[PDB]
Amino acid sequence: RDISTAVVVTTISDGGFLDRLAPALRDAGARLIVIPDRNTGPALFAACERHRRLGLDVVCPSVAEQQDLLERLAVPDLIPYHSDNRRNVGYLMAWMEGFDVIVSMDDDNLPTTDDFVERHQVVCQGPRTQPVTASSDGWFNNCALLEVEPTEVFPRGFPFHARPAHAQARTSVCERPADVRINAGLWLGDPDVDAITRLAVRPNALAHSGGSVVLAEGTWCPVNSQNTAVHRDALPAYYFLRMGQPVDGVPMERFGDIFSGYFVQVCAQHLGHAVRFGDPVVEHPRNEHDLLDDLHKEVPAVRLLDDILDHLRDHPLEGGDYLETYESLSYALQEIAERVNGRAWSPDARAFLHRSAHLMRSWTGALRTVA
Amino acid sequence: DISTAVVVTTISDGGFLDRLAPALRDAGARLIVIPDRNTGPALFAACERHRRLGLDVVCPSVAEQQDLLERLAVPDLIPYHSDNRRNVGYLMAWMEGFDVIVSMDDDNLPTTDDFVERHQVVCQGPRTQPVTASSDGWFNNCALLEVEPTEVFPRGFPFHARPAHAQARTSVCERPADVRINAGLWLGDPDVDAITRLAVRPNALAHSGGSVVLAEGTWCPVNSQNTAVHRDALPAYYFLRMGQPVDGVPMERFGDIFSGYFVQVCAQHLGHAVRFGDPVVEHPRNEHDLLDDLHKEVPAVRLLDDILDHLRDHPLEGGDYLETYESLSYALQEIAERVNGRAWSPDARAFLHRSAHLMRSWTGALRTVA
Amino acid sequence: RDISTAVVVTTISDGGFLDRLAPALRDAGARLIVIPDRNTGPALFAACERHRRLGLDVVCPSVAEQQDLLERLAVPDLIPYHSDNRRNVGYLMAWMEGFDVIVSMDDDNLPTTDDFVERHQVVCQGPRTQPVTASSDGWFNNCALLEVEPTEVFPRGFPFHARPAHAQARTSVCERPADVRINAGLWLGDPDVDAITRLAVRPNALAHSGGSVVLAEGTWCPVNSQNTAVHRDALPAYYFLRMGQPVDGVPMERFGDIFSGYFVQVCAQHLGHAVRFGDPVVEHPRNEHDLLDDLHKEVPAVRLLDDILDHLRDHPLEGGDYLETYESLSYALQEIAERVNGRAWSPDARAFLHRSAHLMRSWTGALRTVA
Amino acid sequence: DISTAVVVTTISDGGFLDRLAPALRDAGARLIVIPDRNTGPALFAACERHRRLGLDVVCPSVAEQQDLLERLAVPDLIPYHSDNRRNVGYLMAWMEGFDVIVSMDDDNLPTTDDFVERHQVVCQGPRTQPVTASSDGWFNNCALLEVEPTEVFPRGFPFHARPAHAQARTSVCERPADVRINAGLWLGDPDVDAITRLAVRPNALAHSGGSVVLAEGTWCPVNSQNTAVHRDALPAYYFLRMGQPVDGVPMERFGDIFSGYFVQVCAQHLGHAVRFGDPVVEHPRNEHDLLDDLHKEVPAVRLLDDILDHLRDHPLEGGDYLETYESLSYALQEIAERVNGRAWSPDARAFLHRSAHLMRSWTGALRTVA
Ligand SMILES: Nc1nc2c(ncn2[C@@H]2O[C@H](COP(=O)(O)OP(=O)(O)O)[C@@H](O)[C@H]2O)c(=O)[nH]1
Ligand SMILES: Nc1nc2c(ncn2[C@@H]2O[C@H](COP(=O)(O)OP(=O)(O)O)[C@@H](O)[C@H]2O)c(=O)[nH]1
Ligand SMILES: Nc1nc2c(ncn2[C@@H]2O[C@H](COP(=O)(O)OP(=O)(O)O)[C@@H](O)[C@H]2O)c(=O)[nH]1
Ligand SMILES: Nc1nc2c(ncn2[C@@H]2O[C@H](COP(=O)(O)OP(=O)(O)O)[C@@H](O)[C@H]2O)c(=O)[nH]1
Ligand SMILES: [Mn+2]
Ligand SMILES: [Mn+2]
Ligand SMILES: [Mn+2]
Ligand SMILES: [Mn+2]
C-alpha cells in the first residue's frame, strides 16, 4: 500500500506539545509540518530540531521560506500573518509533496490511541458498499456519538434553526456505495462546541460511545480542522477561509474551518464522495480562552451561517474534480450574496462572500500553478 | 389597606387583558397600561372594555404621557418605540401614592388567585426571618425551579461566577430583614439570556424550591417581568435606557438587568432585602429571533461582570433611595474610568457616563413631583 | 444622419423641472426617459403626461414596469430602490431601444443654449484627426475651463495627491487621431465640486471661458452623470456604481458616477476612444444639501480613490469591445483590492471592490441577455 | 515681576529647542516639556543640553508624571500616546504658581524677540480699551493675516456661519475689558481645518490686521499652538480628551477646539476677554496625511455647530473659573439630551457626558493641590 500521511499544525507555542504528539506520528512514519508565524518564538524551531533527531519527520519553515513559496506562486497577499490562517501553507506544502493524507490538527490535540494515523487512512480506502447514515432533516449531530455532560450539545458550526426539531428527525442506516475522502475525528474533554454552548453548559466529553458513521448525500455535519484527515484529491476544496471581515461592523473570527468544513463537504458530495465522523479520537485540553471574547468573535459568522447553508442546498455545483467544483462553489457564493435577505445581511455582510470567493479562486490558482 | 398598581407597557392589541384582568380585578389593583407610538387603537378599546367589567385600568395616550413628562422638565428622558416607556407607568403609580408597584410584561399571566396578595410581601416591614446567604455572593433563582433538560442561570447572572457556583456554600439562618423587592418566578420559558436559550432551550416545569430572602452581600439579577417593588424603593428602579453602542454594537434587552441590580444594591445599603419565589406566572414568551436577541445582549454581557465586581468595591451613601441612587450614579462614573479590559472602548465607558446622567434626570423628575 | 438621442433622468420630484427642460429636448426630437422610484409621488407621472401632449417624447415607467424588465433579464437584485442608482434603468432602456446618444442628466440641470442636444451629438462624429490635449502629470482640471470665484477649484472626484503639483504640470495640444465617445458638458452656477471644496470656498461658476478639449491617452479627468453624453457603444461601461458599502464602518455615497466616469474613461482609452469636456453647458442651481452630511457621505470614497486610480494606471486591460473591456476591468479591480495598502484599506474597504466587480459583471450579463 | 511658563508636549528628538530656547532663555521663562511613552531618549539629552546653556527647562519622565497624577487621585485622566499629555504641563505650571501659561507645539517658532513680553498681555488687568464686536457673533482671526490664494477661516470656526459672515458688521469702541487669553497668530501654514487645507492649501504671508480684543457675545476659536492663558483662567483650559466615536468614527484633532471655546465662554461669564494677534509664530507644520486628518476631524465637525449654538442659550454660574468650568460641564450634559440632528447618535450624546465627567475630574485635581 504505502500510504503517506502529513500532519499540518500551525502554532505560536514553544513546541512543548511535540513531546506527546511526536510518538504517535514517529511510530507511523508520518510527516509533521509545523507552520510558525511572525509572533512565534525561536523555541519552537529548537523543539522541532530536537524531535527530528529522535526520528520524527518534522519540518518547520520560517516565515521567510513560506513567503518565498507563496511569492513564486503569485499569491503573496493570500495568507495573512499573525493568524492561524497560515495552516494553509502546510496544506499547500503537503499537497505539493504528494502526500496521500493531510491531517489537519491543532497544537493542543493529542492522539489517544496508537492507531491514530492508521485510522485517518480511511480516506484512502476508495469506493465501497458500506453502511451509510442518513437523516430526515439533512443534518447529523456528531456530538451524539460522544458521552457528554451535563446535557446534549451540538458541534460548533451546526445551524441553529435546525437544532430544535432535530430530536424528531429520523436517523437511518443502509448499505450503499460511498467513497470516504474526509475523516473528522472526535475529541474528548472539551468538545468542539461554539462559544454559546460552552458559555451555557460548559460541556465535558467523557468517552466515544457511538462508533463511526459515513454520511449520505444530503446529510451534512460541520467539519473542523482540529482532527480531520483529507485525501489529497479533496484538499483543493479545504482552503481555510480568511477571517476578519466585518458583519455589521463586527469582524468575524473562529469560523475559518466551519466554512472550509462545509465547502469541502459540499464539493465532495457533488463528486460522489462522502464525509466520515468518529475515530481516531483525540484529547482536547483546550487553550485558555476568554469565552466572552470567543463569543464576540463568533457571533458575526453565526448570524449568517444558517442562511448560507440553506442557499447552498438549492444551488447545484459543476465540475469534474475538486478544483473545478470549488471554483464553481465560489461563483455560487457570490450569487447567494445578492439573493439572500435578512437583517444581518448588511452591505458588508454581502461583500464578505464576494471577497471570500475571490480568495478561494486565488487559492485554486496557486494550486494550478504547482500542478 | 395596601394598594397595588400593575405596570405594563405594550404594543399588542390588548388581548392579554382577558387572562390578566381577573386576578387584578378581584384584588382591586390598578393596571397602568403604557402604549407607544407603534401601539394600535385596539388596545384602548380593550382597556375600555375591561374597565366596564370592573378593572381599574388606565391607558394614557402618548400625548398625555409627553404632557406629563414636559411638566416634570424631562421631555427627552424616555424614548418612544421602546419598552423603556414602562418608566412612565412607574412614575404614575408613584405619583398616585400606590404602596406596591408590580412590573409585568404583556405576556406574563398569573397562575394563582393570590397573585397580588403574594406581591404584597414588600409591605410587611422589618422582622427576623430566614435569610439565605451564599459563600460566593451569588444566588441562582432558577435553582428554585424544575428546569429541563439541564440547570440554567437567570438572564443577567455574571458568567465568570457560573463555573465555581456549584461549589458555593448556601446557608440559611434567622436574621432581621426588610423585604422591599419581590421577584416572582416564571413557568414555561424562564428568563434566561439568549446564550442559554440558544443552547438548551430550557423549559420550567414547576416551582419547587419555595421562596428565599437574600442576605447582604448575596446578589441575584432582578427582572421587570414579574416583580413587585415597594414605593420607597421605586425611585431606584428606573428602567435603564438601551441603545448605547459597545464597540459600535448597540446594546438592548438589559434595561431591567441594570435596574434590578441597581435597586438591589441601593436596597441593601439601606438595610433592605430582595425576595425570590412566589407568586409565579406562566410565560409563553412572545416570538423572538434568538440570534437577534443574542446580537442585542452581547454588548451588555461583555461589560456586566466587570461592572458588578466594581459595584462591590464602592460603598454608597444616602439616607433614602433617591439619595442612594444618585450616589450610585456617581459611583458608576468612577467605575467607568477605573475599569479595564478589551471590551472597555471609549464608547463603552461613555455608556456608563450617559446612563448616570439619565439616572439623575429620573431622580430629578421624582423630586419635582415630591 | 438621423442621430437619435435619449436623455436619462431619475428623480423623486413633482416634475416641475420639466417646464424648463422639455423645450430644449422637444425641439430636437430627443426622448426623455424619467426613472421614478418608490419614494416618488404621483405628481411626476401627471407632469410627464402633460408634457407628452405638448410634443415631448417622454416615458416614465412605474417601478412595477422597471422590476418586470429587470426580472426578465435575471437581475432582480441589481438595482436598489430609494436610490439614484435607478438611473441605470434609464441607461438600459435607452440602450435596448437603440438610441445613438444617451445623455445622463439630473433633475436640476437646465440647458442654457438651444443647441444642447446637437452639441452632445459630438460622441457620434467618429474618428478624426483633431486637437488633442495632454498633461504631463496625466490629469486635466476641467474646472479650469470655467470662470470660478473666489478661487480655483478641482472637480468632484479629482485625486487629491495630484492637486498640489498640478499647477506645475505642462499642458500641450497637438493634432492627433481621436474618437470621442463621451462628452462631459460643464455647469454654471454651482459647479460639480466635492463637499470638501464646497464647504471651503463655496465656488460659483460665472461663465464657460475655456472652450472644449479632447483628452489624450494617459490624461484623465473625472466624469459625472449630471450632463454627460455617452455613445451607445460605450454605454456598457457606464454602469452607475452601487453605493452604501462601508469604509471603516462608514457607508460611502455620492460617488456612483465618479467610479462610472473613470471606468468608462479607462475602457474608452483602451479601445482607442476619447473623452471630451466643454459644451453644452447647463445651469446648476443645486438642490438643498446638508453640506456636512454630503461630506460625511463622500469621505469614505475619497479615502480610497487616489489609490484606486494609481493602480488602474499600472493595470492594462483586455477586450475588443466595451462589454469585454468592462469585464476585464472588474477583474482588475479585484486584484487591486488585494495588492493595495494603506490605513484606509480595512477588510470592508477591500470587499467593497470585490462586490462592486460582481455587480459590474451582473450589469454586463443583463446587457448580453437583451443583445 | 511676571513669570511665564511655556508648555510643549512632544515625541520629537528635541531639535526644535535650538530655535525655541533663545526667545525663552532671554526672557527667563520656564519651558515645561512633556514627553510621552513614544518619546525617544534624545529629547532628554536635548533638554539637558539647553539647560546648561541657561534655559529653565524641565522634562519630567512618564514615571514622574504618573506619580504626580496618582497623588492627585487622577491616574486615569490623561492617556498616553496622545498630545492630551500637555495637560500635565498645564497642571505643573499652575502648581508652581506661574502667572502666564503659554501653550505651544514643538513646531511653532517665535518670529520676534518680544515673544514672551507680548504674551504677558494676559496680565495687564481690566481697563477701557478698543473692543471689537461682530453682528453675527463671530470673528475670523484669519482675516488679520494676508492669506493666499483666498480667504480662509480658522480650524473650529462653525460652518453654518461662514457664508453670511461676509455681510456681518464689525465695530470697534472703547469699553472696559480684562484680557485673560491671548491667541497669537501663525505665519506659513495657518491653523485651518483639514477641509480648508485640502481645498486651497492656504499660505499665511504676513500679519497685517494688528490685534483685537473681542467683546462679550463675539467668539472665535482658540487653539493651543501659540496661546497664553492667565493662571486664573487656566482651570478652564483643560485639553479635551479625544477618541470618542461619533457614529462609530473616533474624533481627534479637536481637543483644543473645545478647550479654546470652553475657556472663552467661561472667561466672558466672569467679565474677561480673549485677544487675537501678536505675538506671531512661524509654523512649518509637521508632516500630515491630510485625508487622515480629515477622517479624524469630521466626527467633531459634525457636532460643533450644534454645540456652539446651544452654549449661547445656556447661562453659566460660578464666581471663579473652577466653579464656572464645572457649571459648564453640567450645561454640556443638558445640551447632550436637548440637541437634535442626524449626527446625534447615542454615542455622540454620550461623548458630551463622558467629557463632562473628565472636566470635573480635571477640576477636582486642581482643587486637590489648591
Ligand atoms: N500561525 C498562528 N497560529 C495561531 C495563532 N493563534 C493561534 N494559533 C493556532 O491556532 C490553533 C487553533 O487554536 P485553538 O485555540 O486551539 O482553537 P479552539 O480550540 O477551537 O478555540 C492552535 O494550534 C494555535 O497554535 C497566530 O497568531 N498565528
Ligand atoms: N412601549 C413599547 N413596548 C414594547 C415595544 N416592544 C416590546 N414592548 C414590550 O416590552 C415587554 C417585554 O418584552 P418581551 O418580548 O416580553 O421580553 P422577553 O420576554 O424578555 O423576551 C412586552 O410586554 C412588550 O409589550 C415597543 O416598541 N414599545
Ligand atoms: N430614484 C431616486 N432618485 C433620487 C433619489 N434622491 C435623489 N435622486 C436624484 O438624484 C439626482 C442627483 O442628485 P443631486 O442632489 O442633484 O446630486 P448633486 O447635485 O451632485 O449633489 C437628482 O436628479 C435626484 O432627483 C432617490 O431616493 N431615488
Ligand atoms: N505626548 C504626545 N504628543 C504628541 C503625540 N503626537 C503628536 N504630539 C504633539 O502634538 C503637538 C501638536 O501636533 P501638530 O502636528 O503640530 O498639530 P497640527 O499642527 O495642528 O497639525 C506637537 O507638538 C506634537 O509634538 C503623541 O503621541 N504623544
Ligand atoms: Mn484547541
Ligand atoms: Mn416576555
Ligand atoms: Mn444637482
Ligand atoms: Mn503644528
Numbering used by the authors:
A (entry chain A), C (entry chain A): 4 to 374
B (entry chain B), D (entry chain B): 5 to 374
Question: What does the article say, verbatim?
Answer:
MtdL from deep sea–derived Marinactinospora thermotolerans SCSIO 00652 has been discovered in the antibiotic A201A biosynthetic pathway, generating GDP-L-galactofuranose (L-Galf) from GDP-L-galactopyranose (L-Galp). The MtdL subunit is divided into three regions: the N-terminal region (residues 1–111), the core region (residues 112–291), and the C-terminal region (residues 292–376). The characteristic DXD motif (Asp109-Asp110-Asp111), together with conserved His287, coordinates a Mn2+ ion, which stabilizes the diphosphate of the nucleotide.
This Mn2+ coordination is slightly different from that observed in other GT-A glycosyltransferases, where both aspartates in the DXD motif coordinate to Mn2+ directly. In addition, β-phosphate forms hydrogen bonds with the side chains of Gln229, Arg257, His287 and Arg289, while α-phosphate forms hydrogen bonds with the side chain of His292. Structural comparison of GDP-MtdL complexes in the absence and presence of Mn2+ indicated a major conformational change in loop A (residues 288–292), which follows the Mn2+ coordinating His287 on β15. By contrast, loop A displayed two conformations in the Mn2+·GDP bound structure. The side chains of Arg289 and His292 on loop A formed new hydrogen bonds with the diphosphate of GDP in the presence of Mn2+.
